Design a protein around this ligand. Structure first.
Ligand SMILES: COCC(COC)N1CCc2cccc(N)c2C1
Ligand SMILES: COCC(COC)N1CCc2cccc(N)c2C1
Length: 150
């Protein structure tokens, strides 16, 4: 009973989280996941500011209201070569990665590791935070509050 949460650097408090390295987070799970990081789903304005500080990914993820990919450099296989905050328009499916926003983070690029999931609740799951540099922090707990997400 294990979950890996791969996390990025924060940019103006905004970061990306993927669960088990595949698109697998529902919209309800995304909100609960950010809550476990003492964070919220970013607004579009928060995401735009993060992009301006150097944030980009090649992954669809929830923000408040939309599913997006922040892009700085045009890449043909990431957001169909778009730059800016690319908004997903048409999809059949409901599960993506998520973005999260931590107001207490530094204002610009913070590429230090994440070493806590401060607002997880008690539970039976071994939850591992995996940083891009491989640094890992584990704890037993839970973050999902909706039965359909488990
Ligand atoms: C009825 O559901 C109780 C849930 C959710 O708490 C609101 N938790 C409660 C805390 C907890 C601790 C260790 C193992 C498990 N399974 C659980 C289950
Ligand atoms: C936005 O990045 C999504 C992808 C990048 O694929 C190379 N995953 C790749 C696997 C991984 C492992 C640990 C932390 C992070 N951030 C990541 C990021």
């Amino acid at each position: 009973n294990q979950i890996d949460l791969n996390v990025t650097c924060r940019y103006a408090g905004v970061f990306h989280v993927e669960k088990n390295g595949r698109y697998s987070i529902s919209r309800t799970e995304a909100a609960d996941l950010c809550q476990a990081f003492n964070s919220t789903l970013p607004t579009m304005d928060q995401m735009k500011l993060a992009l301006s500080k150097g944030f980009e990914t090649c992954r669809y993820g929830f923000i408040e209201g939309n599913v997006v990919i922040p892009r700085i450099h045009p890449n043909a296989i990431c957001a169909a070569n778009h730059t800016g905050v690319y908004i997903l328009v048409t999809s059949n499916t409901s599960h993506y990665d998520t973005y999260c926003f931590n107001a207490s983070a530094p204002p610009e690029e913070d590429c230090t590791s994440v070493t806590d999931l401060p607002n997880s609740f008690d539970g039976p799951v071994t939850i591992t935070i995996v940083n891009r540099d491989g640094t890992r922090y584990s704890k037993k707990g839970e973050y999902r509050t909706h039965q359909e997400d488990i």
